[PDB]
Amino acid sequence: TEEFDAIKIALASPDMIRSWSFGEVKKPETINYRTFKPERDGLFCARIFGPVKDYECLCGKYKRLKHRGVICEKCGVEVTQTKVRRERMGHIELASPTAHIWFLKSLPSRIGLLLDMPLRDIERVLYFESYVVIEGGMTNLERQQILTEEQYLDALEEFGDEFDAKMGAEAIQALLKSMDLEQECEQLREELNETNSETKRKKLTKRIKLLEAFVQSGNKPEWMILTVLPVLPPDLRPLVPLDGGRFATSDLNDLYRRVINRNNRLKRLLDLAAPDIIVRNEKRMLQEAVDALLDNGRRGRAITGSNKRPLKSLADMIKGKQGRFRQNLLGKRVDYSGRSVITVGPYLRLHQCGLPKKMALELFKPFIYGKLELRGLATTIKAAKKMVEREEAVVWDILDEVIREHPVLLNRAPTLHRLGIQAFEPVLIEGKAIQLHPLVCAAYNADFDGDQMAVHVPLTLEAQLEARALMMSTNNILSPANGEPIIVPSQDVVLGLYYMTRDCVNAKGEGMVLTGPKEAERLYRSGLASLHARVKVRITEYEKDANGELVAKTSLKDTTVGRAILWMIVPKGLPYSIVNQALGKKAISKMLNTCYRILGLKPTVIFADQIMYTGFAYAARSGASVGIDDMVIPEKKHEIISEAEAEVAEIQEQFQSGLVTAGERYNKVIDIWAAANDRVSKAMMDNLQTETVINRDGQEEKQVSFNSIYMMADSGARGSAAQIRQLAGMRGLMAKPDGSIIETPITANFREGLNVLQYFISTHGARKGLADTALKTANSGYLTRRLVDVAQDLVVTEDDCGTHEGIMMTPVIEGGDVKEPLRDRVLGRVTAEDVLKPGTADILVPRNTLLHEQWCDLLEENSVDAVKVRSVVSCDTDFGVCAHCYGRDLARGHIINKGEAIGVIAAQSIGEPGTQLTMSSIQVKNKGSIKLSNVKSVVNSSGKLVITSRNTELKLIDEFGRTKESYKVPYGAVLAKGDGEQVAGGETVANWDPHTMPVITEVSGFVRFTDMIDGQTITRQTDELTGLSSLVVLDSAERTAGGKDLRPALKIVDAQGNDVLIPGTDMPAQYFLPGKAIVQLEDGVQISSGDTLARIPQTGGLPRVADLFEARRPKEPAILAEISGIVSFGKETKGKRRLVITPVDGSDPYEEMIPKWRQLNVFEGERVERGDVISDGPEAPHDILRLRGVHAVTRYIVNEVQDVYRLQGVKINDKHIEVIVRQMLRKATIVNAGSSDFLEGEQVEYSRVKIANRELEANGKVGATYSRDLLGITKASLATESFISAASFQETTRVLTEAAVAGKRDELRGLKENVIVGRLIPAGTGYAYHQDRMRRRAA
DNA sequence: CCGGCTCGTATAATCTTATGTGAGCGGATAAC
DNA sequence: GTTATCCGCTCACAATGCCACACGCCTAACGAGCCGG
RNA sequence: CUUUAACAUUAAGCCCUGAAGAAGGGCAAAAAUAAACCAGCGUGUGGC
Ligand SMILES: [Mg+2]
Ligand SMILES: [Zn+2]
Ligand SMILES: [Zn+2]
């Protein structure tokens, strides 16, 4: 029907089924097919469902339209349309009751969770193997106690009429309604208030939440068991018309026939007083038959004749890649469409495409019919059909009137990102292929290798106007993933423009003088002066530094004839120094980009067209071919290979004498072949790039070459140094598929021949790369599918949330070069707070403005290192994202409008380039200030600097204050310098030992042995070839039971032998000793201030991004600190080693367990702040969230995923990854109960908690306390309020079972739901629809 | 002169190169 | 002893899109049919 | 015994609307439900 709100779901009562149906099927036969009338009371019928033909009795009595409503008596068939055959249900009244298969085997077992009874027991009740007891009463036995035949017989001896024990589905049906619901809830609530054990509280909170949701619905525990089973309207499972004889049956019809045969046989056996064994067996057969009908997968049994495939049950018509969500309710086939192969056609403009004439007559047939019947050239529709099937000459003029302003959508099939479908205007072509403008071809990522494209037609008025405004190809220049133009001129235009704008030192007409650029053109056409000969010309140029107008300026510049020709298509704005250089690929790309920045939109489009036209024209007049004498072999290749063979023979002889081992032999050979390959490549590149010597009109000079493939590489059209390296120099080192890299490299190039073995070796890398591509495609597609499932319901919905939180951005520095500066990251995001000038108390930026480009430069000039800026993850708006929390939009210019469905474009921007992926001393480098962060150090006796703080960090600074470089300075290392010591570059400023942990002291004196007994705790090991016998101290577990209860310790004393206190505190720090602690300076030996007491020895591709957005737990994570306090070890081997951290003021209830196998960092007297590392390794983000706050997990995810995308040169803006992070941490647990109705262990979406706390804080009550969860993206999709949006995604079965038990109700808000139903989307245009509806509802 | 043959048709049965997850449940396992 | 945990076994559920093309989708024995021997 | 005998027909309701004994209904009770005539899905291959 129409005008309906939210969809409601619940269980279905038997009386509801009798309210549905229109008759009772009794006979299992479909049709007689002697005559093809349907059999009465079969699966097909006419009295039950409806008329076979239109408006006719099956008897054939009433055949007139004016007899509607009155049924026949010859056939009992209501004279109605055959659409009624699509819509009337049927019912079957079963003999025995029957268990539903989903509620038994969803696995959370709904019956088993409800009755508190294990699943296997209920299974061997339902399949007739046991008994249950139903109100035994004055009986030894209990209720849920189950038996066998022997205990049942012995009970019949004992309590022969007391207990009531049944079996089969009737017994479970008896147990279900015998149970109350209120008493179980109140009893188990009192029991949960009388329980402290955790797992019992888990199970009981599950059971009472099940019961409370089950009572707050409408339904009952009787309804999980079927009694009356409904059947589908028989047009919806149609009988296949074959050719000759019989009709081919579907799967549903065979399953219903089997069920009805079994039901009739059981009903007759009940009619004749059958013995008990046979009716038990028959009820088991009927239960198994209904379990085969509803879902064939739990018992994979029903297979048909001549095709041993599982038949398609009703649940198989919903799941999978062919059920009604993925197949038919999202991707529908569409009329007015078409398909062809494509073809270039370089004469087009940017906003049009080539359309075949005949196919365009075929598409627009109704518009043609309307134009013909308008102009009087026809009267009926059949006259118009005859005229357009004759293809008379008036029809082509009519078709050209139909085209003129009516755009057409074009599409390429594996659509990744939102530039995949675009709208053009048509230009008619007598042909059979679709022409397509060549600049757009990079955006589609189209070949011309046979790639096919498709055509759709917008046909209403709003669709034409949207395809003109929102989607015409003159409106998509910048990319939504990053603000870069997608209209880069490709390979051939690059070659043309690079060949035009060069120079050579002696040509025709060199050094003459010219008037305009057009006289240089007239000299090029006549053949008087060549295309590139240097010449002084006169140029006028316009500069718009005047505030909104143009300033002329005329001068004489030393330039080239080709550059003067190219200047004629540059518009008024740009300065002449944009076309004075050699103009490769990136140069003309930034030419287009600066033309977009300074002038606007329309000169950018028309300038890209003029560039494409003249680039193809002069690429034609070049004649740049390629030939076998354009690949210059070096003259020095032969002796380099000879010297490499001499060196490998010498290393082979040094291995043969036995001096060098095999691994170092391997390493020397691979190093010298790497060096030889690099030398040959250097020689060939130096021989190609500059060999061209030409006569000056003096003697000789040098210049950049005019060789063919060097122009094809130096312009950046096709190829790199690597491909042109393999063509003439030798090719690399081929690696075998085991993972090793082979000894002998391929000594030959491609211009010479390869022999048999070397080609056979190269085949390995070929097939490896091909298989990698073949699997990488599918994995990227699946990950894109899941991300756009997650982020779909999120729309920029209001203007200004108006908060004062956010994040702090600093330009990222690994320690090598600064990877991303502050300009590129925080271009175009709205400032959180007023970042002050380095001139203090001077407002450099207002707190609530937008960092546009000029403003970004004026922020850059004062060398700001950290800017605070508003993110999406802290935006305040319920059910959406505020506008100023998201900033300016990519692919357009200004701030984002209210409605842009940013979650979908974000998921596409992450998931689009997924195909391109794959599947001992600190040394400063420049001069600046030396800053050490979290440093607490002391100079020892030997002048070295040992640090008593773990978290020391190195910052190389300039004179300004911005960070030049950064490194990590370990705890207590060998430091060549101190803090703030102004040093210069190239300096190794630090060192340490990777096999010695610092057990450094704090005072001077002696070190004495407390509980360090040789034979109990410590051992005396003599280094047998040096002479310094030392002591080795283990931990408690590695030594035996003689020192297991003992704790060895190096007690820090003075030279007298007494504990000198730490300067600042009053605590003696005796040093208890961990394992592998080699104590060198023993008792009686004087120590220093912080001296080494004990020496202690110790992915990346696409699945990294997959395992990160799943947020799955890494192996052996890093233990953090829960709250600050003094560390204290405790009891050993109660599973693990205990640890108690005592706060300064609060108590210490948490006594954390640590596997003593894994190592540790902190010491006993040491105390650390919360969230700090204990055992090194990977980290799960759960801990990062619950300890370091909310922004920390966003920064961790952004930096890691952005490292994986910076490794391949892929540039993706950060706000997309932020708005994917927001949809991951939306659920929440509750810590208290609060003052409202929320339970404690209640998982609940955060925004409802936030509006509940806002409503309670409006009054004077107390709120609730919540811990923000963090789920995987598939777990976040699969737990959503809309039960449609979780049904369309994977595991539809479990979602429909849980949603049908709970009886939910889906508001239809979001994108995916309204696509399913088929009204306007609440995202784009139609957003302005929905709130216009919403104010209609509330008022 | 009913079904022996011959046909219309309704309906029952002895794999064996996969991976990675999560999620749950039965059996051991370390304490007052 | 008995109780609250830890761990190994078993099992459901996912794995891009589109295109063309092409050939496939029962029968030994239980209720009727013909009429010969 | 004086010139052919025979007048029959007892059974189906009550109430409302309606110009009526013109007609339209409900309730106490029940056997029995030709024609003149507008006009698919499951395997394989290949491509991107
Ligand atoms: Mg291609
Ligand atoms: Zn009829
Ligand atoms: Zn906000």
UniProtKB/Swiss-Prot annotation:
Its cofactor is Mg(2+); Zn(2+). Its EC number is 2.7.7.6. The lineage of its organism: Bacteria, Pseudomonadati, Pseudomonadota, Gammaproteobacteria, Enterobacterales. It comes from Escherichia coli O157:H7. Disulfide bonds: none annotated. DNA-dependent RNA polymerase catalyzes the transcription of DNA into RNA using the four ribonucleoside triphosphates as substrates. This is DNA-directed RNA polymerase subunit beta'. Keywords: Acetylation, DNA-directed RNA polymerase, Magnesium, Metal-binding, Nucleotidyltransferase, Transcription, Transferase, Zinc. HAMAP family: RNApol_bact_RpoC. Mg(2+) binds at residues 447, 449, 451.
